[PDB]
Amino acid sequence: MKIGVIGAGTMGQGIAKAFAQVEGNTVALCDIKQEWAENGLAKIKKGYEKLVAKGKIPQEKADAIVAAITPGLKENLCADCDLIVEAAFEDMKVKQTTFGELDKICKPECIFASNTSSLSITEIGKGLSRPLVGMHFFNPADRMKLIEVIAGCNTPAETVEKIKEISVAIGKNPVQVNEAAGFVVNRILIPMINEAAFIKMEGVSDIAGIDTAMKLGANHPMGPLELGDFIGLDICLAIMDVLYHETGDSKYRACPLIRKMVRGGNLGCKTGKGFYVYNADRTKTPVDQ
Amino acid sequence: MKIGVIGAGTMGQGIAKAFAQVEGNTVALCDIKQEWAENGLAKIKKGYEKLVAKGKIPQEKADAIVAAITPGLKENLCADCDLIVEAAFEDMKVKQTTFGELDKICKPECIFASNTSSLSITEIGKGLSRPLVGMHFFNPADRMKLIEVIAGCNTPAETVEKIKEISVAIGKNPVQVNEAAGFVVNRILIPMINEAAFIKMEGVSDIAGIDTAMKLGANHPMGPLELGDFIGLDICLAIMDVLYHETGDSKYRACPLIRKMVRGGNLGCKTGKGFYVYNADRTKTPVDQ
Amino acid sequence: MKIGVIGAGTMGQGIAKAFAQVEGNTVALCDIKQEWAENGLAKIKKGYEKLVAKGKIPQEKADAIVAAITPGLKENLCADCDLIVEAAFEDMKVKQTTFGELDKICKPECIFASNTSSLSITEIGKGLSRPLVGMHFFNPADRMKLIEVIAGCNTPAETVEKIKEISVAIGKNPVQVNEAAGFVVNRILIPMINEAAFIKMEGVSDIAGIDTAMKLGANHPMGPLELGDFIGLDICLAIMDVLYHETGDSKYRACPLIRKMVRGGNLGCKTGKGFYVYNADRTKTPVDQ
Amino acid sequence: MKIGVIGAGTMGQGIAKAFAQVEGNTVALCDIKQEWAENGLAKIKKGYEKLVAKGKIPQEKADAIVAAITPGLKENLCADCDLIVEAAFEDMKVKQTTFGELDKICKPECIFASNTSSLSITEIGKGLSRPLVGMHFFNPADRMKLIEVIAGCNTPAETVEKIKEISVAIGKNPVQVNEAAGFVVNRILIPMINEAAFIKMEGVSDIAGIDTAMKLGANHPMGPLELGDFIGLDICLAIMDVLYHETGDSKYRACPLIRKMVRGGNLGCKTGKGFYVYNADRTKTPVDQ
Amino acid sequence: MKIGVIGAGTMGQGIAKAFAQVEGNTVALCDIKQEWAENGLAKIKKGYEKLVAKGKIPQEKADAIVAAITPGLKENLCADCDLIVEAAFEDMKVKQTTFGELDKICKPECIFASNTSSLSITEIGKGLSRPLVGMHFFNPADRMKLIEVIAGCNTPAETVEKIKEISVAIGKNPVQVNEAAGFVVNRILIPMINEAAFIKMEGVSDIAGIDTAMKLGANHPMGPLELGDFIGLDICLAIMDVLYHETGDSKYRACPLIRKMVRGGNLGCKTGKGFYVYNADRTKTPVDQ
Amino acid sequence: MKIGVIGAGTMGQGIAKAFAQVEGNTVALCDIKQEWAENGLAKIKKGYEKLVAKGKIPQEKADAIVAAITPGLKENLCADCDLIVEAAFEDMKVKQTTFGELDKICKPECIFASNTSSLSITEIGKGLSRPLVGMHFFNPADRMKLIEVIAGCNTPAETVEKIKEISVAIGKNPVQVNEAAGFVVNRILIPMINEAAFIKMEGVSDIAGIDTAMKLGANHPMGPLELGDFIGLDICLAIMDVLYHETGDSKYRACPLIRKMVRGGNLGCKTGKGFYVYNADRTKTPVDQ
Ligand SMILES: NC(=O)c1ccc[n+]([C@@H]2O[C@H](COP(=O)([O-])OP(=O)(O)OC[C@H]3O[C@@H](n4cnc5c(N)ncnc54)[C@H](O)[C@@H]3O)[C@@H](O)[C@H]2O)c1
Ligand SMILES: NC(=O)c1ccc[n+]([C@@H]2O[C@H](COP(=O)([O-])OP(=O)(O)OC[C@H]3O[C@@H](n4cnc5c(N)ncnc54)[C@H](O)[C@@H]3O)[C@@H](O)[C@H]2O)c1
Ligand SMILES: NC(=O)c1ccc[n+]([C@@H]2O[C@H](COP(=O)([O-])OP(=O)(O)OC[C@H]3O[C@@H](n4cnc5c(N)ncnc54)[C@H](O)[C@@H]3O)[C@@H](O)[C@H]2O)c1
Ligand SMILES: NC(=O)c1ccc[n+]([C@@H]2O[C@H](COP(=O)([O-])OP(=O)(O)OC[C@H]3O[C@@H](n4cnc5c(N)ncnc54)[C@H](O)[C@@H]3O)[C@@H](O)[C@H]2O)c1
Ligand SMILES: NC(=O)c1ccc[n+]([C@@H]2O[C@H](COP(=O)([O-])OP(=O)(O)OC[C@H]3O[C@@H](n4cnc5c(N)ncnc54)[C@H](O)[C@@H]3O)[C@@H](O)[C@H]2O)c1
Ligand SMILES: NC(=O)c1ccc[n+]([C@@H]2O[C@H](COP(=O)([O-])OP(=O)(O)OC[C@H]3O[C@@H](n4cnc5c(N)ncnc54)[C@H](O)[C@@H]3O)[C@@H](O)[C@H]2O)c1
């Protein structure tokens, strides 16, 4: 009911879908400007009718979700609608600038969670009139079932359990984690991608060989270079850079190959080229040749 | 072709099975003592008709397979083989002595391959005449389809691809690796386990929560703390120390909590207690609770 | 001699008292506004009125010390001063703005000194027409006998000696420091407290355990965690980051637990909460239980 | 109760005094040879007569304290003892074989404790039939009030509790320390001295300056360089090496200046030259001038 | 060939001379306005005549190289160019916008190039209509023969080879560099200078000794401490910090002594004082006595 | 003056040549066995068929150099030597024993010098009746004109000044060094080669391009990879390890490529294969093609 999704990108669309999938949620997909928001809802819709083509979901529910999602600026969001899940740029200032009113133009009745993957939950919510909590999704947010619950330094446990019940009543498994850089999943998962980059940069193996070896030798559903393309390399570099800045530990130095690629605009799937090139045939070719 | 397997342990049997399921590839499964190569051999037979008993093999092959493997010790079986996949104690001097002995035994066109994980392939065959290559199987070597081919500093390109051709001929998917500590799999997988222990020691979450987070948010079949008990925490601590000694990079410094548990005999599954207590009724209780 | 103390705060007051406590030393206590300056003086007087009523100083000298301190702002009273000791905000351009403005106001023979602890003496006085030196007092400056004489890159040895002589002229012991981060005391004392936070965060011991251990085993007047809240965790955090940034050495990486508390506004005694909760009944409870 | 003190050295003598100081406590002071155990008792009795002649302890109690300590060998005396504190050479295999001996001579209900400060108490007692705990006394043990209770990986919470009861009973303050290198005091105090050496090596300040800065700017009873000369630079270097090897963290790297002095035999007070030259005139002169 | 050299500073003048030293070459020397753009040509002409005065080039060629250069503004002169080489302020946003203009002023087949020492070629050319490549010159650019060719993340192999051909066509030896921090020379040379400062700061050897040790022990033409002053200590400090920030590796931490000198304006030859005081008599004197 | 050079290897012969080519210098080239002492003199006199068959020197003085070097072993020749220069195996245990009896054999006014590049001068001369000082030559000692005078902990400055006196007498340039790992040249030069290896391993540039870039870009007479092969990659790897284990800083970690090549016996010029393949035709070829 009146769920607030700020950010209409890779995962704002997934959280919008994950909430609008169930009974009634009437979800609010907002972005920087109006057309970028409906561009994200259009991608949600084209996916939904590409998924009735293969008959994995009926046609009536596909638009019941798309019609429950209202695109736009924060002008449908900020009528004190409900619990709000920010999915904006992985940058401390932008995550706290927007939250300067998502507590305010909403009634302080509401719950203000952030889907940040490494940032400090406490510093995001440093001056708002009500707690800021962390609800952490994983892409695709409609398929994956884990929700990382992160309590702020002085965030009351009232907010933490009311959001644990929200995820339970959506088919998700809530697990509470104490606030630290990259919490639990990303602090373990992202350096795996960072290490595969180092392995390729230092000529240990090729791109396809790194991803095959992690899939057959460790039974992983996707290799780390594949996984970095799916997440988005700009996000991967931002998470690695937060871990380094917070800890001061060179254990988390981002591999220079990834920063070179992110500077080149090759962020993976969302840009059409990562460690692999994404051809129109829905096929995937390693950049190594 | 005839293949020797120096060592009849977990990897000695596993590799022998992978070399027995196809054709007139006769394996000489050796060990230090004949009492044990048959012990080894006896263990493989039991697991076969553990599964002949389950309508999934015909025993006409589960017998032609076990008949192809002949047990003994190196000198009285290994004069007429074309490939030696040694899998012995992970010690630099036992493998150097071994290949120093088999060099004066085997055919002068028999290929010498090592199944080591943490030792330098180049240093193994430094005193030998014929090239030494890396052939890294994965537990269990019968069904695991990945083989890391390790090219040493002086491993000719010819030797590498013949191992790559033997690997495809036995259904395995090979990958070429230029010698570096932890090649690909263990260089990514083991620091992942190491980072999970840092999560626990720093109190970011509990043992169960870390494991469940990694199978629900990253789709991993086993949790990292789970896997560390399976592989063996002594094996993981040794690999982290190899990566740290080889590179000098404090990025691969082993977690002090893991070093504490190894000195306590709590090596995981093979000792009854690891990160989880392995009770008699098979319940897996985290030592945290 | 006449001395101009720029800044009428905690250290400006203590430095004004340290100089006027002598005899031929008169002080010019300056601040942002005049009312903010004679504010600082009014508190210096109230202190000396209490020290009189306890029988630990006569009234006639408490009168004489206060009579030697004249409030106001600079430009009006710092033209004849022989020594300038700034006690302004820990901000580079603030001290640069201030020292450049006094460069025209003070007579050529006026020595310029700064009280900073984390800012580079050499950089503060870059464009100044005269040398700049460091005079590091320790709170409370009127009773603490140590003064660090910080020599800059272009601080002439003679300027160093004139600070040495004035320091002995007021009963203090001057210790010369060649400009480095954390000079001598902070570079040793703050990584001490920083180590205590790492010990607590990694579950080595409890808060009450660490502090009483450091005062019983090392005979220290205060535990490090206690001392952290007393100096202010924001101050200790900024010092570690200055150490880390200047040297680039991960040895001085700030403990994430301290950075978490500073984000939550828990800075210690000055906010009621720290490693200890400073209760209204003036007791002090470890936050561990 | 009866307390077997193993090792009649500096710490064993003080620990024997710290126990025989209480009324109902009997001490067995053992060593390698019987005569060596009696020489240690002769020295504590000598220090007691020097205390009676100075009127700080009546002659009645010194004779009672001395009569509670009986020297000898491991088997003859330690059979019927309730607690065992070992104070032997800081050698992993020395302490390992000693506790294995007592595991067959000491009664089952006897408690096994070690005075080690650099070795892993988990590893010390890995093969014993009973738990091991750490009881880290402080020199001089007869008047130092701290006791560090070291809980290993398999030290039960019950054993930690009874060690704290005995410590409170003999007038000491227990502090539970979960096993980590340098526990609490040494992990904080030794890097402090190590930092002071770095400050001198980099020419920040001279020797006497650093020490007087720490006693006047931090209210410490002794300067860090002074403290190292009193502890012994060989031990301070050994501690830093343990911290560096157990963590793998460049943060705990020893100052090369210290290692150069240790190689030169300038270990401080016990050699007559450290950071200070210790003349026969009871004076102390820094190497700097 | 027509070459547009954007930036009339120290390297812009030399790079313009390296191209006009050859014969079918026209050079446009651009700046922000036109006066200082013609000034840059005036500094060149004055440098050129002092060579004809000593007898090192005839007036026939000195004037002819001057005539091949045209000062002015970018739009007026660069629409008909075949190569662009920017030598502007080492600032990422500045270089990003000038190539945005040139992307629509220059003809389709014109080749862009950047002389940057410390900024990512990939990022400079993120959204251009044509590839961006690095052409690193070395000061003095008209006689030094090395030209580092930097391949960005998206720089085609063809455009790099065209730059290679342009290098030999003007008398230079090109070397291909896949973009990394410091490319090749600065990544090796600057940490060499940095290490010399570390050797000095820690009291290993004197300034005069370190230099003579490197020129006589390694047969270098200059010592590392005098080379740093020749380059400029601010330049060297900026290279070490870009290396440190790009790699996140503490291996490239800048020597605090170099940082202190830059803050004090002791930048080397260009300021008359570095590790050596460059004298009236044009002879150098170490600051070490 | 008469000198005793202990050792007949490359540096033993080289220091013997460097001394015997002045005039009043007589050398006692002592080794472990006489026959190998005449070995060194033979290689000296064999190579000296390239100074008179080249006729630079007249055999009036071209055998007065080979006549000044007298073979034999230690105890029979060094009873009255003016200076001792050991060049034995780079092993701490061997050198102390060597100087241990030279102490009793040589006259009291004999100066003890050592040529070690990695071992600690202070530790070698700990238990001696006279100070030991470092005299570090550079291969080839006859042509290289630098001498690193290494002052140990207990080495007097007076003893340093006479090593400087002797160095000028033989035409060399002494530089005083205070004992530190890798002194000055190796601390700067070997990390150069180490960084060049990292550049190759990380795919930044090829072996040939890296070398010409350092020759043409920094005016170095040799490339850094070239110099590693010339110095010997085993000695280069040993220095980095010595630099790493002494400082404890991961700044000095050895490149894994170098460690790989050393394990493969590809040490450079003295084995025929390094970073270049050294042809008998006196040319070389990079291993990159
Ligand atoms: N990429 C992942 O797999 C995932 C992992 C878990 C956490 N999330 C977190 O979600 C956040 C969003 O990143 P993403 O993965 O969706 O990639 P993304 O960059 O494509 O999505 C970001 C979206 O937010 C929009 N946006 C930016 N600023 C905004 C503002 N002020 N107001 C409204 N909208 C704004 C952007 O236009 C963009 O559409 C990240 O910060 C990340 O921490 C990332
Ligand atoms: N999952 C794993 O354990 C992992 C997987 C990849 C490869 N690695 C490597 O494979 C190799 C085999 O290890 P494992 O898992 O089988 O442990 P293991 O101890 O069970 O196997 C050792 C076997 O080799 C025998 N052996 C020892 N020395 C011998 C000798 N000199 N000659 C002949 N036989 C000898 C032993 O008797 C024993 O049977 C190891 O080097 C290991 O590093 C194992
Ligand atoms: N125990 C300590 O507080 C510690 C001790 C050593 C020195 N340091 C340094 O001493 C200096 C004094 O800090 P503080 O502890 O007194 O905090 P404070 O806030 O109490 O003192 C700051 C005072 O300086 C005034 N001020 C600001 N700008 C001014 C200006 N341009 N001209 C005149 N006055 C100005 C402010 O109005 C304020 O009253 C700081 O730089 C601090 O880093 C303080
Ligand atoms: N200031 C300190 O001395 C410091 C304080 C904290 C604890 N530590 C630890 O205390 C323990 C002892 O320190 P110390 O200074 O007294 O050593 P020490 O050299 O002064 O004397 C040790 C005594 O133990 C005896 N001993 C050795 N092995 C023995 C054995 N197998 N059986 C019986 N006796 C044996 C020795 O004969 C010797 O008398 C060490 O583990 C040390 O790390 C000492
Ligand atoms: N020896 C060296 O200094 C070193 C050598 C190799 C290359 N690097 C790189 O060369 C480049 C230039 O270095 P420099 O020595 O000339 O410093 P510089 O400051 O002297 O050059 C700046 C010149 O370029 C002009 N300029 C600035 N912005 C401009 C713009 N937007 N358009 C046109 N002109 C502009 C300025 O007016 C000025 O004349 C830098 O990127 C530097 O990193 C310099
Ligand atoms: N580029 C270099 O070679 C480098 C340069 C500076 C000095 N260093 C140091 O110079 C010393 C000599 O180096 P090297 O290359 O000539 O070694 P080497 O391998 O050439 O042989 C060492 C020589 O010393 C002899 N020797 C060994 N032990 C002896 C002993 N106990 N008594 C007498 N003679 C003994 C040996 O017989 C042999 O002749 C080493 O310590 C080395 O680290 C060498």
Residue numbers in the entry:
A (entry chain D), B (entry chain C), C (entry chain A), D (entry chain B), E (entry chain E), F (entry chain F): 1 to 289
Give excerpts from the publication:
The A2HBD has elevated expression in F. prausnitzii A2-165 and is crucial for the transformation of acetoacetyl-CoA to 3-hydroxybutyryl-CoA in the butyrate cycle. The A2HBD protein exists as a hexamer in solution.
In the structural analysis of the NAD+ complex derived from crystallography within the P21 space group, it was observed that all subunits comprising the hexameric assembly were found to bind to NAD+. By superposing the NAD-bound form of A2HBD with the apo-enzyme, we observed that the monomer structure of the NAD complex is similar to the apo-enzyme structure, displaying a root-mean-square deviation of 0.543Å. Like other NAD-dependent dehydrogenase enzymes, the NAD+ cofactor binds to the Rossmann fold domain without forming significant interactions with the C-terminal domain. Observing the binding mode of the NAD cofactor, adenine moiety of NAD cofactor is somewhat exposed to the surface of the enzyme, and the ribose and nicotinamide portion fitted into the deep cleft facing the acetyl group of the substrate. The NAD cofactor is captured by the enzyme’s Thr10 and Met11 main-chain nitrogen atoms, establishing hydrogen bonds with the hydroxyl group of the phosphate moiety. Hydrogen bonding interactions involving Asp31, Glu90, Lys95, Asn115, and Ser117, along with hydrophobic interactions with Met11 and Phe138, contribute to the stabilization of the NAD cofactor’s two ribose rings and nicotinamide moiety. The hydrophobic pit accommodates the adenine moiety, fostering interactions with hydrophobic residues such as Ile6, Ile32, Ala88, Phe,89, Val94, and Thr98; thus contributing to the stabilization of the adenine phosphate. When comparing the catalytic triad′s conformational changes from the open to closed conformations, it becomes evident that in the NAD+ complex, characterized by an open conformation, the catalytic triad resides within a hydrogen bonding distance from each other, thereby contributing to the stabilization of these critical residues.
